[PDB]
Amino acid sequence: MTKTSKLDALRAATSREDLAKILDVKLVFLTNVLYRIGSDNQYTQFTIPKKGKGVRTISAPTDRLKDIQRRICDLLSDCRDEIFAIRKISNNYSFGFERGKSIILNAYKHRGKQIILNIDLKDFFESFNFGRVRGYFLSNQDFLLNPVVATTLAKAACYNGTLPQGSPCSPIISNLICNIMDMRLAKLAKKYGCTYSRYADDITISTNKNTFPLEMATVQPEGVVLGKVLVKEIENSGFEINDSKTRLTYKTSRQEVTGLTVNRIVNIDRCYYKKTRALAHALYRTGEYKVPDENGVLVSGGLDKLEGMFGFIDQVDKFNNIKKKLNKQPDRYVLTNATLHGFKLKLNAREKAYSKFIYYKFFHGNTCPTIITEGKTDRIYLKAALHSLETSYPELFREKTDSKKKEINLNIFKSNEKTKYFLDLSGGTADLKKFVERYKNNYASYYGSVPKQPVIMVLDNDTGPSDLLNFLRNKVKSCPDDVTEMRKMKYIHVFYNLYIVLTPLSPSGEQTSMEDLFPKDILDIKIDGKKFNKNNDGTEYGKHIFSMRVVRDKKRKIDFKAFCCIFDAIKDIKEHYKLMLNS
Amino acid sequence: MTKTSKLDALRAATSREDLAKILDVKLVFLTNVLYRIGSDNQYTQFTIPKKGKGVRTISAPTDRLKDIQRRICDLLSDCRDEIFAIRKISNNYSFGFERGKSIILNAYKHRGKQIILNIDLKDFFESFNFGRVRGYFLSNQDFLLNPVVATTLAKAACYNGTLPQGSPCSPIISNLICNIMDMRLAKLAKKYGCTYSRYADDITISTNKNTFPLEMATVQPEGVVLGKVLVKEIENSGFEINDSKTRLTYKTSRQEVTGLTVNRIVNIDRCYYKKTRALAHALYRTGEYKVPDENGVLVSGGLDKLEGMFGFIDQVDKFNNIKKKLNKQPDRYVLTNATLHGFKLKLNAREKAYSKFIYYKFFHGNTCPTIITEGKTDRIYLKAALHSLETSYPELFREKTDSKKKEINLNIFKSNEKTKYFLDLSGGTADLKKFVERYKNNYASYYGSVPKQPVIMVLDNDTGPSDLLNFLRNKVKSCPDDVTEMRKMKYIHVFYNLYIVLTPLSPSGEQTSMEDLFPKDILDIKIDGKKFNKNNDGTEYGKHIFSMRVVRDKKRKIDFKAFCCIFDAIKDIKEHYKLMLNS
Amino acid sequence: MTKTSKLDALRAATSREDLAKILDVKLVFLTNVLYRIGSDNQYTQFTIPKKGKGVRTISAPTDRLKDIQRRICDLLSDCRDEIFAIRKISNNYSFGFERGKSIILNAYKHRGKQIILNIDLKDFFESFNFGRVRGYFLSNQDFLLNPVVATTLAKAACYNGTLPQGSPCSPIISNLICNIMDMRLAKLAKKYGCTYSRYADDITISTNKNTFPLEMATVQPEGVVLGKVLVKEIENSGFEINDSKTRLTYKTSRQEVTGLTVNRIVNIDRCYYKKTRALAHALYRTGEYKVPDENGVLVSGGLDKLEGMFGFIDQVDKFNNIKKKLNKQPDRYVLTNATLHGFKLKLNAREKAYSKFIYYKFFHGNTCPTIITEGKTDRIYLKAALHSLETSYPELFREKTDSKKKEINLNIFKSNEKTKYFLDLSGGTADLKKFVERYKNNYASYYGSVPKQPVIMVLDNDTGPSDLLNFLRNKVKSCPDDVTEMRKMKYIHVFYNLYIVLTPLSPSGEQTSMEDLFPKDILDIKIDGKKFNKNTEYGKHIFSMRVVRDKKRKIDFKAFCCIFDAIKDIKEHYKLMLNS
DNA sequence: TATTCCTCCTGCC
RNA sequence: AUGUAGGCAGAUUUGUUGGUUGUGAAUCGCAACCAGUGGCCUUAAUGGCAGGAGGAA
DNA sequence: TATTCCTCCTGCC
RNA sequence: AUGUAGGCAGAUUUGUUGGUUGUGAAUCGCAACCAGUGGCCUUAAUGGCAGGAGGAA
DNA sequence: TATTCCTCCTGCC
RNA sequence: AUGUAGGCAGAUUUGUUGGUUGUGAAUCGCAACCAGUGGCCUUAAUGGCAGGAGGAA
C-alpha cells in the first residue's frame, strides 16, 4: 500500500478473499464475474485493417472484466515498481508498456548507431498462454504466490488460454514474463557488441560495427537471415519471429526505431513533419484541411487532431532541446538581444511551424473571441465574474449535450512558459506591446484569411498600458483624432480584429485597475488575519491569495455588479466585428 | 518579327527571293555571293598551334559571305528560340553556342558529382556535311522548308561538303543538328543514373556513384574504355570520339567541366587565379607585367588584358555569391559595427585581389588624372563643360587612332554598385571621407611605387565636405592651422597624389556648389510648368532631369565659363605633381 | 667562446696538449684521469626497473671523468653546430639529444599522418664500440682529427667497447655517428613517400597512404613485419632492431610519437592530462595529493611536482597556440563585452586547469603570505627594504637549507605576461580591482578549503586604489560604515584571507606613494646629472635598478617599517581568525 | 533503328 | 533578270536514395551541407504506456 | 538448458 | 456463502575502442562531435636535450 | 657496397 | 715530464596529389582544414556564346 508493501500484501494473500480485498472489489462480485459468467464469455472481437490482405484482431473485455483487469494492472505495475526497487536495478531493456518509458527513450538507446537490426515477434500476446502466466506467478521469486491467488490472476487475465490484446492487464504480464527474454538477449547482445532494446514485440539490436556480427544476422542475397544463436535464444524463450518484418538498415537509409529516425539524433519522420506542415498550410489557406477517415474518404479534420500531431512533433523537439542544453558550451558574440520577430531565431523550422499554428489557433482561426489579460490573476477574476452573471450574458456561453454543463464561450488566453517560448507572451506589458507591434505581420502571414472572431485585450487603466497607448497614438491612428478619448472609452479598435478594453475609471476619473471592480465588502476580507494588499505593492496577502481564496471562494458570496460593464463591452465588440464582415 | 513568327516567314518562303527578303538582303547580292563567285572561292585558311606541335585549321569566310552567314545565324537563332517557345521546352543539355548559356551553367550542372567523364568529338564541324544540313532543313518537322530555300541555306552555310569552323552560322546549325544526339544521350544517361551535358564538342557525363556505370565507361588497366552502348550512341548519330581525350576523374583529383572546377563548387582553376594574382603583383611592383606572345618572347601586356582575367574570375565569383544569397542560412551575427577596412571582410581572397587591382587602376597606376566627384550628376556637368571648352584646354585631351577624335584625358570616376562592393564608394560624402581616411594605407599597400598622375577630388565648397575638411585639420594637418582659409584657394594638396578641388566661392564669399557655376539665365528653363529644383530637397524635376535636359542637350550652347576655374585647378594640380615627382 | 673557431682548433690540434688546452684542463690532470686511473674503473653502475621482467642498466662516470666528458660534450656540440653552419644545411631528421630540438618538434613532423610506424633500436649506446667512435673521428670529413686526438677522445668517451649510457658525451657522439643512418633512412623514406624522424633510438616513419608501403612494413597474422629493404638499411648501418617494440598504428588508435598524441594535432596524452587534473583536484579538496614512489608506496608530493606536470602540458599548449596564431582567421564579432570572468573564454580546458592551479598556488594554498602590488618596481622596493631590515623582522624570514641561507618568507607576487594570460593580473590597478571582485568566487571554487595564510595587497594612499576604495565602500562593506577613514588604518580586512595595506598617510594628509616613503636624500640622488622623476629625467626603472638595488650607499628605509608591522598584524589577525 | 477528476487529440505496439 | 548540289530526329528537355538544416500558395516541392547507388515492414483500439489541448472542483 | 650562477620539479630517450 | 486450471527466470539491468572539445567532490567519470571493431611497448637516471617554479651577485 | 552604335580585353569550343 | 688500443659516410637535410579557405616582394610559395597514393587532354580565331573596360548618340 502507498507504494510501499503492495507486493507483500499480494504474497501474504492465501485465498480469493485476500485477493478481492487487495483489488478492492467484493468477493461475490469478483467470483461472479470470473466464474459465474466465465471470463471466456465476456470478450468482443474487432478488427484493425492491415494492408497485407488480412487484418489485426483485437479481443476486448466487455465492461466489468475490464474493470477487474484494470485493477490487476494497477496492482502488478506497483508490484513491478517495488521489485525494481528491491533488486536495486532499473529498466534499461523494456520500453513498450512501461511506466516512465516512451518511444523516445527507446529510440535514444540506439541513437547514431552504424547498423540497426529490427525484429518483430509473431503473435506476441498469443504466445503468453495460461500455463505460462500461472507458472510465472507460482514459480518466479518475488511473487511465489499461493496456488489459489496465482490461478485466479491467470484466469482473470487469459481469454482462450492466452493473453488477449485488449485486456488492460495483458501489457504488464507480458513485460513480467518477457523480462526473461530481455535478460537473455541483453547478455547475447553484450557478448557480440550490440545495444539491445524491446518495445512490446519490437526488438532493436544496433551496433557501431560496419558489419553486423555473423552470429546475430547476415545479409544474404535472399535478404536478412538471422543467426542461429539469436533465433534459438528467441525461440527458447517461447516466442516466434515474424520473418517478413526483419530489417537490417545501414546509415545510408532511414534508420527507424519505433517510428523515429536515429541516423544522427532522435527525430520525427521527415515525411510526417512535412505532412503536418502542409496540413497547417492548408488550414491557414482555405479554411480547413482534409484527412481520410476510414476508407480514403476525405473529411475535414479538427483543430484538435492537428494540435495533437504538432504536440507529437514537439515532444521530440523538446527532448532534443533539453539534451542540447546539457552540452551547450558558452560562446562569444552578441546580437540585438531579441527584437520584433527576433524571438523566433532560437526556434527550429518545426518549432516555427508549431508557433505559427498556435498563433493561428488563438488569434486568427479562433472560433470564439480570445481574451488576453495582463497577468496570472485577471483570468480567474474574469471567469468568476462571467460565471456569476451567466444569465446576464447568455450569448457568452455554449451548450453541452443536454446536461446543464454550459461553458464559457471564450478563449481566456493563459500565458505560461510555453506561450513565452513559442509566442513570446509571458503576460508582461512589454510582451503585449510587442504583440500589438507584430500583429500586422502575423495577420498578413495567413494568406489573406479573415478571422471570424475578434481578439480582445482586456487590461487595466494607466497601470500597465502606457507605452502601448503611446504606440497606439503615434503609429496606428485608427481614428481621426484620439489622444485621451480612447483612454476613457467603452473599447478600442486597433487593427483588423484586435480590440482593447480598458478597465472603466471611477466617477471621479481615477485610474482604477481590475481589482477595483469588486465591491468594498470583499477587498477588505482578511485571510489568516492578513490584510489584502491593495494590488501587489506590499502581514499582507497579494493578488494570488486574493484570487485563490476570495474570488474563487464561492461561499464568500461575491457580487460581480461592477464587472457587467466589461462583459457588455465584449458583447458589443462581437457585433461590431460582424458588421465589419458585412461591410 | 515579333520574335515569334520569323520561323513562320522562313516556312512560308518558297524561292530565293523570299529567303533574301527574310535575310533583308538584295537578291542580286545574295545570288552573286553564292553562285557567280563560288562560295568555296571566298574562304581563307589559318592555323592555331597545338601542344603536340599540332595544327588546328580554321576556314574563315571573306566579308561578303560572312555578312550573309551572320544574317543566317541571326535568323536561325531566332528560329531556335521560337521552336523552344512553341514546344514548351527549355534548353537543359546544350551550352556551347547557345544564347543565355555559358561555361558556368555547364559546370554548374555537374557541380559536386562523385565521378566526371569527359568526352570530346573528333572533327566536330567536319561531320556536319552538306547532306546533313540540307536534309535537316528539309525533314525536321519544325522547319520542313521548301527544297530551294533549304538548298540555298545549306549552300551558303557549307564549305566543300562540311561546315567551316569560322562561319558565323556553323554554331547554330551545329546545335540544331546535334539536338538529336543530345536527346539520345540524355535518355542513355537517365537510364544509367548520370547527368549529361554538352558544350560544342565537349560532352560531360557525371554521376554520384562511387563506380561509374559499366555500360558507360570502365577503367581498364590501359585507361578509360567507353562502354559499347555509349560509343554506339555517339557513332550512330554521325560523330566520332577523339579517343585520346577521354577522361574519367574522381573527386581525389581536379574535376573540370569546360575550364571550371566542379569538385565542391563551380570555381576557377586555382593555377589561373594564382597567376592573375602574381601578374597584378608584378604590375604593382615594377609598373608592368610580362606575358608570352605568339613568337614566344615576353611582352608587357596592357591593363586591359589584365582586368579581363579579373573579370573572368569575377564572373564565377558573382555567380557563387548569388547562389549563396539564395540559400544564405540566416542566423545571428554581429559585424562589430563595421570600421575602416571593414568592407573587405565580406570579400574572399579572389575578390580582395580584384578590389586591390581596381583601386590600383583608378588611384595608383593611372595613365591620366582621376577625378572623383560625389553623386552621379557632377561628372555629367564636368564632361559637358570639358567638351565645351576643348579649345581652351588642349592639354586636358588626348588624340584617337588615325584622323581626329580628341577625348577627355581624365578618368572621370563613376560610382555604382560594383564600386561600392569592391572599393566602398557608393557616391556619398561619408564614403568619400572614409576614402580619404584609408588613402594612406592604400598608398602604402602598393610596395612603395609612386603614382605617375594625380587623383583630384572635385567637391562643392563646404556644403558637403564640411566634415571632411575637419578631418583634414584634425588628423592630417595638411595646412598650417587652416580652418576656413583653405576654402579660398583654387586647389588643395591633401597628401601623396591626392588633391582636393573645392568650388570657387561666390563674389561675396558665400557657400556655393558647382551647380551654381551655371549662368542664372539657364537656371530656370522650366518645362511643362515644373521648376528645376536646384538642390532637389525643397512635382519638381530633380537634379537628374535638369542635368540630362539642360546640360547634355545641345542647341542651347550653354556658356561654360564658370567651370574654367575647375580646369585651371586641374592644370595647376598636374603641374604641382610633375614638379613634386621631379624632386 | 668562438664556437666557429673550436672546430678549426680541434681539427688542427696534433698533441694531447692542444686537446687539453681546447678543453681548458691541465694536460697532467687529463692524462692522469684517462690513463693512470683506468677509465673503466671510474664508472658507477645502477639499474632502473622495467615494467616487464627486465631492467635498464646505466653506467655513469664517477665525478671527474664526468667533468672531462662534459667538456668533450660541449666541444662536440659546438663542432656539430659549426658543421651544420658551414654546410648550409639544417637538422630535420634528428631531434634526439640535439640542441634546439624537442619531442614536440619530433611529433609535429608526423602530425596528421594516416599511418605511423614506430621502431626502437636495441641496445642503442651498446652498438657504438670504441673502434667505431675512433674511426668516425678519424675518417670523417669536417673533423679529420690527428690520430692522437681522436684516440684520446674515444678513450675518454668509451667504456669497455661501448659508449656509456650515463656519459655526458655519449649523446652527441651517437648523434654524429647516427647521421649516416639518418641520411640513408631519409632517402629511403622519401623513395616510398614517408616522413622519417629519429629521437635517440626511437625511429618514426609516417605516411598519409592508407596502406603502408610493402617495402617498409607489412601487417601479417603474426603482426607487424618490417620489409627487407628497411631492415637491411638499418642493420648495414650497424644497429639492431628491438622487434618486440615495433608498432604500426592507424588513425583509429592513439598515434604516439615520442610520448605525444599525433592523430590530429600535437597533443599531450589524454590520460596524463586527466591524471594531472585529478591530482590538482585532490590537492584542492584535501590538503595534498598522493603519488607512488620508487618503492611502490604513495607519498604526499609537493607543489613542485604538480607544477612541473602542468608546465609540461602547458609547453604543448603554448606550441599549439603559436601555430593557431600563425594560421588565424580574421573576423568581427563581440567577445562577451569583456565583463568579469570573460578572460577565461580564451583558455581551453587544460589552460583553465593550469590557471586554477596557479591561482591556488598564489592565493589559496600558499604556505606564506602573498604580497600583491600595482607595478614592477613596488616589489623591488619591498624586497630591498626587507633585505635591509633582516635583523629587525626575523619573523618574515625562513631558513632554506639552514646554512645561513635565510630568505624572505614572504611570497612577493610577481606579475608578467603569464599571470595576465592565466590570472588576468598584469599589474594594472583595474586588474587588482577585478581581482578583488572575483576573490569571493575564486575562494569558493576550492571545495570549502580554508587558506592557511593571508593575502595582502600593498598599495599607496588613495593615489591609484581610489577605485578599490570606492568598491569597498559601495560593496562588500567589511566595516559597518566608513567615508574616508579607510585611507588611514594599519590594515583592512576585505574577505576571508584578503587584506589591503595602504602606505602610512602623511601627517598633514597629503597622499603618499612608495617613493614618498624613501628619505628625502635618497630621492634626491642623481646619476649622470639627472633628477629622479616623481612618476633630463629618470623613471622608476632606473631609480630601482641603480638606487634601491645598489647597496653601495647603505641607503636607509625609514617609512618602510610601518608596512612590515602592518603585515605582522595581518598575520596575527588571520591566525586568530583561523583559531576562532 | 495547488491537486484531484473528467472530455477530446497525437504517437508506438 | 537569274544563276548545281550529298544523311536527320529512332521527334524534343533539368538522373537518383537517405539524413540534417532552411524555406515555399505546400496533404507535397525546392535549396544547401553530409553520406551514398544493399534490402525492406508500413490504412495501430474500444487496451497499455508516453504525451498534448481544454474544462470543473 | 638585465646576464651570470644556485636549488627544485616535469617530459622524452 | 462461493466456484476450475496446462511452461519460466537457465534468477535480474545501460555493448565497446581511439581522437578532439567541454565539464565534473574526480589519481578517474560523464556528454557532444569525428572515426571505428587490427595489433601493440609501457616503473626512463645520477646522463643529454626540451621546458617549468623560484633564490641570489 | 536615352537605349543605339563604336573600340579594346577575358574565357570556353 | 709523461703516461695504449677493435669498421661507418656509400659525404649531407623538411616525401607527395587534389579541393576549399587564408595569406605572402609572388608569373609562384606558404599555412589551415577536407579527401587521397588511378588515369589523363592541354599554344582555342579573324567565328559563336557568355562576360568585362570605356567613348559618343
Tell whether the torsion through CA atoms of C311, C315, C318 and C320 is positive or negative: negative
Q: Is C120 annotated as a binding residue?
A: yes
For C330, name the nearest residue in chain B, comparing CA atoms only.
Answer: B345
User: What is Dmax (Cα atoms) for chain B?
Assistant: 91
Q: What distance in Å separates residue C107's CA from the closest CA in chain B?
A: 27
CA distance B68 to B65: 5
Which amino acids of B are annotated as binding site for Mg(2+), given as ranges?
A: 120, 201-202
For A348, name the nearest residue in chain B, comparing CA atoms only.
Answer: B331
> Who's near C343: CB < 8 A, 6+ residues apart?
C424
- Cβ-based contacts (< 7 Å) between C 492-551 and strand G: none
For C349, name the nearest residue in chain A, comparing CA atoms only.
Answer: A329
Nucleotide nearest to C102 (CA to C1'): G50
A56 touches strand E (CB under 7 A): yes
- What does residue A140 show for φ and ψ, rounded to 5 degrees? -60, 130
Using an 8 Å Cβ cutoff, are B101 and B91 in contact?
yes
Three-state SS for A342-410 is: HHHHHCCHHHHHHHHHHHHHHHCCCCCCEEECCCCCHHHHHHHHHHHCCCCCHHHEECCCCCCCCEECC
Q: What is the CATH number of domain C365-518+557-579?
A: 3.40.50
Using an 8 Å Cβ cutoff, are B134 and B151 in contact?
yes
Q: Amino acid identity of A372?
A: I
> Who's near B57: CB < 8 A, 6+ residues apart?
B45, B46, B47, B165
- What does residue A29 show for φ and ψ, rounded to 5 degrees? -65, -45
CA distance A507 to A488: 12
Q: What distance in Å separates residue B327's CA from the closest CA in chain A?
A: 15
B92 touches strand E (CB under 7 A): yes
Q: Amino acid identity of A286?
A: T
Cβ-Cβ contacts under 8 Å, C332 against chain B: 334-336, 338-339, 342, 345
Q: Amino acid identity of C385?
A: A
Instruction: Locate breaks in chain B with C to N over 2.5 A; list the residue preceding each.
Output: 538
> Who's near C399: CB < 8 A, 6+ residues apart?
C405, C406, C407
A403 touches strand E (CB under 7 A): no
Q: What distance in Å separates residue A64's CA from the closest CA in chain B?
A: 59
Domain boundaries in chain C? 1-87+145-156, 91-128+163-267, 270-327, 365-518+557-579
A332:C337 CB<8 A: no
C334:B334 CB<8 A: yes
C-alpha cell at B414: 563613376
Nucleotide nearest to A236 (CA to C1'): F1
State the architecture of B364-519+559-582 in CATH terms.
3-Layer(aba) Sandwich (3.40)
Using an 8 Å Cβ cutoff, are A406 and A399 in contact?
yes
User: Which among B114, B332, B337 is the top mutation candidate for probing chain A, defined by the most A β-carbons within 10 Å of its own β-carbon?
Assistant: B332
Nucleotide nearest to C312 (CA to C1'): F10
* Strand ranges inside B467-577, DSSP E: 492-495, 498-502
C-alpha cell at B140: 525536321
Rounded, the Å distance between the CA of A329 and C1' of E13 is 51
C334:A330 CB<8 A: no
**Residues 316 to 335 of A: which have CB under 8 A from any B CB?**
333-335
| CA torsion, ordered A515, A520, A522, A525, to nearest 10 deg | 110
Q: What is the CATH number of domain C91-128+163-267?
A: 3.30.70.270
- What does residue B310 show for φ and ψ, rounded to 5 degrees? -60, -40
C-alpha cell at B537: 530637397
Nucleotide nearest to A544 (CA to C1'): D2
CA distance C415 to C377: 11
User: What is Dmax (Cα atoms) for chain C?
Assistant: 92
Using an 8 Å Cβ cutoff, are A539 and A530 in contact?
yes
CA distance C49 to C291: 17
Alpha helices (H) in B216-303, listed in sequence order: 228-236, 270-286
**Residues 332 to 371 of A: which have CB under 8 A from any C CB?**
332-334
Quick one: which of B180, B199, B174 has its CA closest to B141?
Answer: B180
- Taking the alpha carbons at both ends of chain B, their separation in whole angstroms is 66
Nucleotide nearest to B308 (CA to C1'): H10
State the architecture of A93-128+163-267 in CATH terms.
2-Layer Sandwich (3.30)
C335:A330 CB<8 A: no
C-alpha cell at C525: 640622488
CA distance C64 to C11: 25
Quick one: which of A437, A483, A484, A427 has its CA closest to A459?
Answer: A427
CA distance C244 to C564: 64
Cβ-Cβ contacts under 8 Å, C346 against chain A: none
In the DSSP assignment, the letter for residue A582 is H
For C332, name the nearest residue in chain A, comparing CA atoms only.
Answer: A333
CA distance A469 to A487: 8
For B345, name the nearest residue in chain C, comparing CA atoms only.
Answer: C331
C-alpha cell at C17: 696538449
In the DSSP assignment, the letter for residue C484 is S
Three-state SS for C288-302 is: CCCEECCCCCEECCC
CA distance A194 to A206: 5
> Who's near C376: CB < 8 A, 6+ residues apart?
C415, C427, C540, C541
3-state secondary structure of B559: coil
Residue identified by cell 486574493 is A546
| CA torsion, ordered A81, A87, A91, A94, to nearest 10 deg | -90
DSSP tally for chain C: helices H, then strands E:
20, 20
Rounded, the Å distance between the CA of B445 and C1' of I25 is 12
Using an 8 Å Cβ cutoff, are B268 and B275 in contact?
no
Tally the C-alpha atoms within 13 A of residue A223's C-alpha that lie toward its C-beta. 7
3-state secondary structure of C164: coil
Q: Is A201 annotated as a binding residue?
A: yes
CA distance C170 to A219: 62
CA distance B463 to B514: 10
C-alpha cell at A171: 501489457
- Taking the alpha carbons at both ends of chain C, their separation in whole angstroms is 62
In the DSSP assignment, the letter for residue B240 is E
